[model samples]
Target: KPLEVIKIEDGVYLHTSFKNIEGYGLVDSNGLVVLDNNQAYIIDTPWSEEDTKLLLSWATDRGYQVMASISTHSHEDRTAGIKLLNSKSIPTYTSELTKKLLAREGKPVPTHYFKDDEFTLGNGLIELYYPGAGHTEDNIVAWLPKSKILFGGCLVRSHEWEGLGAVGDASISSWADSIKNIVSKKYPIQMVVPGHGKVGSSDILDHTIDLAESASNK
Candidate 1:
C-alpha cells in the first residue's frame, strides 16, 4: 500500500507514505503521532502536503491538537511538509546534529531541539540518545517509556532493503556507539518505528546495531 496506517496502540497511529521510485527502496516517509484523548505530537512530515494533510486531518478530525513535529532527518523526502506544518503553529524538532546538517544543507532549523537525553511529548517521552552514528550524524531514536516503543528513524531495517541518501554528511563510526548507548541503557524497549520499514520490537534495534557494526567493519 502506498499509504498504510497501523494503530500503534489505542490512541497512537503510525503511517507510512511513499512513492515507488522503481529501483529505490519505497521512497518511504515515516510519520507517526498520537491521536484521541491526547492533544498532541507528530514525528516526521509526509513527503507532500497532500499526504501530510491526510495524516494531520485524521488527527484534527479526532479533535486532537498537533502541537509538535519531529523530523527524522533533514531530507526533503521526510521534511518537505514543514511549511504546511508551520501554518498550524506546530513546532518541529530534530537533534543538534540534524540542526547542523540542515544548516549545511540550507534546510530550515527546527523550532525546537532535542539533544542530551530525551524530550517528552505528553503521551510518551521522545528520547534522543546518540552514542555513535549509523543512519547519519543526525540520527537518533525516539523512545516512549510508557509504550516502550522506539521510533528508530532510518537506523535499522528488519527487512532486507537499502535506500540511498546523501551520505556525505554521515558519520559511520559514531553510528555504532549511538546504538551501543541505546543498548547499554538497559531500558525495556517493547517496539520500534523504523524510519522506512514496518514497525517491530526491541530485537529490531539489536538487528540495526548489528547491521551498522558489521557494515562499519567491512
Candidate 2:
C-alpha cells in the first residue's frame, strides 16, 4: 500500500507512508488528517511525493475539502511533499525554524511560515503546540480537543517502539523534559499518535520518556 489511512475519530484520520532511506531500510512515517466543517487540514507530509498525492486524492474522494498542510519538523519524512503541495497551490504551513532548516538543506520550504510557538485552525478545533524539542529541534505536536487526540508527531514515540528513533537531530538530554509539558491533565489526551508505529493512549508519552532517557544515558 502506498498509504495506510485509518480514521482515528469522527473526522480525524491517520496516514502512514513508507520510504527506504539509503541505509535505514524500509521505514514508515505517520501524519494526520483533521476534518472540521468539511475541510481537511493535514499535519506532516507523507514520506514521498506519490504518497502525498495519494493522501490528497483520498481526502478529495472522502469529501473533505482541502484546507492546507503543515509540517512538524524539518526531516524529509515530514516535509518531502512540499513540491507537490506547492504545485497544487495548496497552502503549506511550517514554523519559521522548520522553514529555515529546510532551506539550509536546500529542500522545498513551506509556502507559509510562522514564528508563534502555538496556534490553532478550524475555529480552534486543531491546536498546534511546540512542547520544546525532543525528536528534533524543530519538532511540534498537534492537539484535537474534540477528539482528545494528540498527534504527537516525532516528538513522541509509540509504545511498541522500545528504542528511540532518528536521534541524529534529536535533543536527547532534553527530550524527556520536553515531554513533561504534554503529560498534564489539561489536554486529557486519550489517543496518542506517534510519528510512527501503533497508536495508544497517554501511556505512549510515558514510553517515549523512558526511551529518551535510556538512549541519552547510553
Candidate 3:
C-alpha cells in the first residue's frame, strides 16, 4: 500500500508504514512531517526508497516545499530515504553520533550534525535531544513545541510493544533512565509518536519507561 499520512494536529503529520527487518521481523514504523507556512521539515523517512519519494512528492504536490530532513537515528528505517533527499538537493541534519554510525554502515550520511538543539522552521520550533540510549546507541527524540508532540523515535517503544526490541545496540541498563530524561510531566506532550505502532499521549512515555525497566530487570 501507500504511506499513510495521519494528521496529528494543525501542522503536524504522522507517516506510518510496515517494514521488514532481517532478523527482527516485520515491524510498523512511523515518521513525521511538521509543516511550516508553505514549507515543512521531515523527521524520519520510510523504510523504502519508493515510499520516501512518494512522501516527498505528496507534500510537494500540496505546495509544501520540504525545507529539510532530519533522521532521529541511523537505523535503515529512519535514514534510508536520505539518499533520495540528497539527490533532490534537500539539506538533511542528524546527530554526530548517528552520522558516524551511518558512515560505518557505508550508508548515506546527513549533511549537517548537531549535538542537541532546537531548530526553527517557519514559525515553529523542533527540539532535538539525545537522552542516552535505548533502542540504539545514537537514538534521539524530536519535540515539536508548537504542537506539543514528541517523536520518540526507536528510543521509545509503542504501547502495543511487550518488551524492548532490537537490543543489539541498546543501552539496556540505562534505557529507562534515558527516557525519563527525554520526556517528563514537565513537557506538555499532548501527542506522542513512536518509531512504530500507535500514537497516543504522554502515557506513551511512561509506557516506554515501564517496558525498558521490565526488560532490564529480566
Candidate 4:
C-alpha cells in the first residue's frame, strides 16, 4: 500500500499507510504532522522509510519545515524510520523505554527523550504526555491544546477496531486506566487520531477502553 496524507483540520495532517502486520493482517497505520507557524512536528513516521521520505518531501514542498519528531511507542509502525529521521538530522524524541526497545532491535535510537513524561512542541502549543502503559510501556499521546487534538497512537484504537489489534506488547489490564487518565486529564478532545484506522472524536478513546476491558476479561 502506498502512503497517503489527509488533512484533519487546517494545521493537522494524517499520513496513512496500509501494511501487513503479523497477527493483525493488513492494516492502515496513521502518522501525524502538526503544523504551527510554518514549522511542523511529526508524531510518528510512516511504516517504511520510503514512505517516510515521501512525507518529508511533501512537507518540505509545502514550505513547512519539520523541526522535530516523536514516536508514540516502539512499534515499527511508529519507529521504523528512526534511522531515516536521524540521517536527516531531525531530532526525534521518544520515551526512554522506547529508546531501549529500539536499541534491542538494533535500530537507531531516537535522538532525544521525553523527560518527565512530557515535552512541549511549537512553543508549548503541543504537549506530549505519557499517560501510562497500554499498547506498550513507552506509549505516549500528543496533545494540541489549541486545536483540541489528541494523537492517541496505538494505545487508543479507532472505532472500527473490534479488538485490540496488536496485544503482543499490550498491557491489557492497564490499558483502560491509561485511556481513562487521558480523558480525565485532557477532556474535551475535539479530535483523536488513532494508531490505525479512521480518525474521530473522544469516542475512539472510549472504544479503546471497551476493547481493552473485554480483552482483559478473556
- lDDT per residue as tens, model 3, 84-169: 99899999888889998898989999887776544443334687777787888888888888888888888887778888878888
Q: Single out the weakest 10-residue window by summed lDDT for candidate 3.
A: 115-124
Candidate 3 vs. true structure, TM-score: 0.92
Quantify all predictions' global Cα lDDT against the true fold.
0.69, 0.87, 0.84, 0.86
Q: How well is each residue in 145-194 modelled by candidate 2, as lDDT tens digits?
A: 98999989888888767888768878899999989987753798889888
Tell me which of candidates 3 and 4 scores higher on lDDT. 4
Model 4 lDDT tens row, 1-218: 78899888878889997788598578788988888889988889999999999899989999988998888898889987788989999989888888888889888899998668777766796788888989888899988887788889889988787988777887889999999998888457899989888889889988888999999999
lDDT of 3: 0.84
Task: Give all TM-scores, in the order shown.
Answer: 0.85, 0.94, 0.92, 0.94
| Reference-based lDDT, residue 74, model 3 | 91
Off by over 4 Å in 2: 21-25
lDDT of 2 at 154: 85
How do all the candidates rank in terms of lDDT, highest first? Answer: 2, 4, 3, 1
Worst 10 residues of 1 by lDDT: 158-167
How many clashing pairs in candidate 3?
0
Query: Which 10-residue span in candidate 4 carries the lowest summed lDDT?
Result: 114-123
Model 3 stretches with alpha carbons more than 4 Å out? 20-26, 117-124
Give the number of colliding residue pairs in candidate 2: 0
Model 2 poorest ten-residue lDDT run: 181-190
